[PDB]
Nucleic acid binder design. Structure first.
Ligand SMILES: [K+]
Ligand SMILES: [K+]
Ligand SMILES: [K+]
Ligand SMILES: [K+]
Ligand SMILES: [K+]
Ligand SMILES: [K+]
Ligand SMILES: [K+]
Ligand SMILES: [K+]
Ligand SMILES: [K+]
Ligand SMILES: [K+]
Ligand SMILES: [Mg+2]
Ligand SMILES: [Mg+2]
Ligand SMILES: [Mg+2]
Ligand SMILES: [Mg+2]
Ligand SMILES: [Mg+2]
Ligand SMILES: [Mg+2]
Ligand SMILES: [Mg+2]
Ligand SMILES: [Mg+2]
Ligand SMILES: [Mg+2]
Ligand SMILES: [Mg+2]
Ligand SMILES: [Mg+2]
Ligand SMILES: [Mg+2]
Ligand SMILES: [Mg+2]
Ligand SMILES: [Mg+2]
Ligand SMILES: [Mg+2]
Ligand SMILES: [Mg+2]
Ligand SMILES: [Mg+2]
Ligand SMILES: [Mg+2]
Ligand SMILES: [Mg+2]
Ligand SMILES: [Mg+2]
Ligand SMILES: [Mg+2]
Ligand SMILES: [Mg+2]
Ligand SMILES: [Mg+2]
Ligand SMILES: [Mg+2]
Ligand SMILES: [Mg+2]
Ligand SMILES: [Mg+2]
Ligand SMILES: [Mg+2]
Ligand SMILES: [Zn+2]
Lengths: 53, 118, 147, 101, 49, 111
RNA sequence: GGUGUAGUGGUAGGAGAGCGUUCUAAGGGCGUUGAAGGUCGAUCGUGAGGACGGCUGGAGCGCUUAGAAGUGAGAAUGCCG
RNA sequence: UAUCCGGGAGUCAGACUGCGAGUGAUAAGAUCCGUAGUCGAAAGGGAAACAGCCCAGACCACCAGCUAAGGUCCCAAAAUA
RNA sequence: UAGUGAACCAGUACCGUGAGGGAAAGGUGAAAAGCACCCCGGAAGGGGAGUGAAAUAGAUCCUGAAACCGUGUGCCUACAACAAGUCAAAGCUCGUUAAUGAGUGAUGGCGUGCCUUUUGUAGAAUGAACCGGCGAGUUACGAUUGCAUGCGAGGUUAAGUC
């Protein structure tokens, strides 16, 4: 099967509506204040739950 | 004496595209689609410059009909009476009176009713 | 000169009429009501704007069906599933849900577009003689001579 | 007060001090023009012409002569490799209404 | 005469007619040859007589 | 004078995939944008991070602006030159391959 | 030039008259105080089409008359990019 | 308007409708003629949509008027005559 | 994209066992004065600072079209059946080659692309993915007719010589 008609710019953009990235789970690290991912070791200071690791 | 393409081609196609400004997507972006649409636009425009007169006479007739009914008369009876009474006010003006000058319209309707009675 | 009047949305005042359907043939009631809803009865009628008035139809259960329409006029509807054709007689609709009877008849006569659907919403049908729209101060609209 | 006059095979509503556009009038700019076919006169009272109000006329001054925006008549038949293009600019006369009788 | 005001005798010179240069000219597309057939071909036509 | 821009041209990456990350950071404080790019695993995140940091370095060094107040006023990706390649396919025929590039631009203003 | 009368759908196709492109000759001009070209504009003519401004551009180009043509593209499962 | 003389063609696949015939089965949107129209090469109104049927031939502009076929309760202009 | 296939390291690259086939590809600036130095970056690439009349002339360099991609937004859009327009049109926004202006457009009417080929095509027949460029009645020698000019019961030279 092949496209019968080429896809227009408007239709193509409509389809890509949901083709987007997202960033979630970021909040300030307790130890150093840098933004980190919740439930992850802070990449900057290497602290999690207030202890170096 | 070689005559290369030059710029006449671009000039002509840009004229068509400017005519097609406002069309949907390719119909305003691409010359071939644009030209095809502009041609249909011409056809529709020529046809509609005739349909336009029909539509407005139709609109005036409907409004005149409503006003005549409010005055106790059908549009057909009103126009027959006006012709008998020699009134040549056309439908455009009659519709204008109906919407705005209801008093003047009532005077015209009374003359039409008088003519019909006679 | 391009001076023809064109009504604006919101400038025309829509009234409220009460139409008693008692023993009025269904179609004729629907026709007069449809003209009112479209606003064809007013000089300010503008085809591309809504200018008609609201209608309250009472005693829908007493609407008149001449001839054998009561049992032989059939309203069909297809569920879009194969063999999904449903039918109900006009008489049965009048007896059980007369509101739908009047509404279907009037829908057929209004335009099949956005403006037409909006104009339909201004219709209110009530089998029986009493309605809840007294707050709108509707006035009776005799149709004995209109039909 | 206002009047309805018969001009250019068409009827126009005129009020003192209102400019009206009509089919070209054979009159120089800035000159006076009298419309004698007053088919109605309205205002506080109403005058109905049968077909014209007797002895009622409208007076105006020809402000301008001009040409209306161009209209293009392009006639073509699909698949018949045949088209014809035409332009038009209808002349008009703009008249300021001075007096209504 | 003056080289900048030359004027041929009236009717002495005509403009060559060029075919296949658009429909409105009246010789577009088919170039006056008609539709299909032997006479519509490049080098078409039968010998004289 | 109130804004500084940085640009990376002819960077090997998909313009569309880059625009995903760019849309994430557009119109955001510089600190927030830096954090988002750091924790975004997509390839273009690192490229855009260097461009943003370069732009901030411009705003500070070249024009002595206020880093804390800096925000990402404008950011976008433009198509760069496309490198043409071919990949053999079945039955002795090749198919073209477009190795895309991107022009990544970031503009950061005082407020 | 005016009036009057009549007429003015159109494929194949015949006739007529024009628009625009490059170049030649002559004449008369325009150009680092910005040509051609590009872009934008609500401009003009009955049509092909013609100007005029803004921006871009950086060195050639109009106009009048006549002349000669590699002289006009939207289609050829056209060729090239 | 016809002739005649000359330059230049295109056309040699037609279609349907009404009427008169053949072939067919007194079938076919069949086929083959005669005859008139229309389409072909004709837009517009009506016939729901609908080349060939009915009305009627678009040089243009108008938010003027009168009619043809066909229509006037609503969609939808006009008689709940 | 012309002109030699070849304006440039072309009969080269490349293709083929071989004969053979056979490309693409010109332009900074007057002058390299071809961006010292500083900053981000591993670099690339940028931002300053400079050269320059001009750097949106920075070497992928004169001009820089269209397709195509993207950013910003004045208007509109989540009850709507759309050959995408045209006619009518409220609202909103804006102010021109100053014109009975411009953009957008709720809503209403009408409305089945272009071409080719056909009796007949919206056609579920053919062609076109889009954009740009190139791409088709020409010339020579004769024949014949019209128009024009010169001469006119005459008209006219061909080769050839200067
Ligand atoms: K011919
Ligand atoms: K210009
Ligand atoms: K092509
Ligand atoms: K002949
Ligand atoms: K026949
Ligand atoms: K430059
Ligand atoms: K946009
Ligand atoms: K529409
Ligand atoms: K086929
Ligand atoms: K001759
Ligand atoms: Mg060309
Ligand atoms: Mg008419
Ligand atoms: Mg010649
Ligand atoms: Mg022809
Ligand atoms: Mg063609
Ligand atoms: Mg052919
Ligand atoms: Mg044939
Ligand atoms: Mg032939
Ligand atoms: Mg293999
Ligand atoms: Mg005609
Ligand atoms: Mg030139
Ligand atoms: Mg050519
Ligand atoms: Mg047959
Ligand atoms: Mg034919
Ligand atoms: Mg027709
Ligand atoms: Mg046809
Ligand atoms: Mg009449
Ligand atoms: Mg009606
Ligand atoms: Mg009756
Ligand atoms: Mg070559
Ligand atoms: Mg520049
Ligand atoms: Mg350049
Ligand atoms: Mg709904
Ligand atoms: Mg909605
Ligand atoms: Mg066939
Ligand atoms: Mg195809
Ligand atoms: Mg092409
Ligand atoms: Zn931390």
């Amino acid at each position: 099967a092949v496209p019968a008609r080429r896809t227009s710019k408007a239709k193509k953009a409509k389809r890509r509506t949901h083709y987007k990235l997202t960033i979630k789970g970021l909040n300030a690290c307790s130890n150093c204040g840098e933004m980190k991912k919740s439930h992850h070791v802070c990449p900057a200071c290497g602290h999690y739950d207030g202890k170096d690791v | 004496a070689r005559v290369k393409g030059g710029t006449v081609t671009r000039k002509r196609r840009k004229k068509v595209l400017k005519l097609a400004k406002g069309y949907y997507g390719s119909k305003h972006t691409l010359f071939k689609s644009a030209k095809e649409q502009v041609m249909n636009s011409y056809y529709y425009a020529f046809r509609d410059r005739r349909q336009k007169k029909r539509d407005f006479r139709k609109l005036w007739i409907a409004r005149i009909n409503a006003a005549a009914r409010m005055n106790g008369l059908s549009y057909s009876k009103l126009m027959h009476g006006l012709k008998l009474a020699e009134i040549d006010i056309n439908r455009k003006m009659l519709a204008d009176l109906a919407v705005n000058d209801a008093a003047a319209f009532t005077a015209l309707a009374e003359q039409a009713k008088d003519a019909l009675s006679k | 000169m391009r001076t023809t009047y064109m009504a604006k949305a919101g400038e025309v005042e829509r009234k409220w009429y009460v139409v008693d359907a008692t023993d009025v043939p269904l179609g004729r009631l629907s026709a007069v009501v449809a003209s009112v809803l479209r606003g064809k009865n007013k000089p300010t009628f503008t085809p591309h704007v809504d200018t008609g008035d609201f209608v309250i139809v009472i005693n829908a259960d007493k609407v008149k069906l001449t001839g054998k329409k009561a049992t032989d006029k059939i309203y069909y509807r297809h569920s879009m599933y194969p063999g999904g054709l449903k039918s109900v007689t006009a008489g049965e609709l009048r007896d059980k849900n007369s509101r739908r009877l009047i509404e279907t008849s009037v829908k057929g006569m209004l335009p099949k577009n956005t403006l037409g659907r909006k104009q339909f919403t201004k219709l209110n049908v009530y089998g029986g003689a009493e309605h809840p729209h007294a707050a709108q101060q509707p006035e009776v609209l005799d149709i004995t001579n209109l039909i | 007060m206002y009047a309805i006059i018969k001009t250019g095979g068409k009827q126009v509503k005129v009020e003192v001090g209102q400019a009206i556009y009509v089919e070209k009038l054979n009159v120089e700019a800035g000159e006076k023009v009298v419309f004698d076919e007053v088919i109605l006169v309205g205002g506080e009272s109403t005058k109905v012409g049968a077909p014209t109000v007797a002895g009622a006329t409208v007076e105006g001054t020809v402000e301008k002569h001009g040409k209306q925006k161009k209209v293009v008549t392009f006639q073509y038949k699909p698949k018949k490799h045949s088209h014809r293009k035409q332009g038009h600019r209808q002349p008009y006369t703009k008249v300021m209404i001075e007096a209504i009788n | 005469m003056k080289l900048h005001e030359l004027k041929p005798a009236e009717g002495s010179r005509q403009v060559r007619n060029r075919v296949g240069r658009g429909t409105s000219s009246g010789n577009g597309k088919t170039a006056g040859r008609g539709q299909k057939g032997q006479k519509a071909r490049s080098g078409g036509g039968v010998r004289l007589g | 004078i109130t804004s500084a821009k940085a640009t990376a041209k002819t960077v090997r990456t998909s313009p569309r995939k880059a625009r995903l990350v760019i849309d994430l950071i557009r119109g955001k404080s510089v600190a927030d944008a830096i954090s988002i790019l750091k924790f975004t695993p997509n390839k273009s995140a690192g490229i855009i991070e260097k461009v943003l940091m370069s732009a901030v370095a411009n705003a500070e060094n070249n024009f002595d602006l206020d880093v804390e107040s800096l925000v990402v006023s404008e950011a976008f990706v433009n198509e760069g030159p496309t490198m043409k390649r071919f990949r053999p396919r079945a039955k002795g025929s090749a198919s073209p391959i477009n190795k895309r590039t991107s022009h990544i631009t970031v503009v950061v203003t005082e407020k």
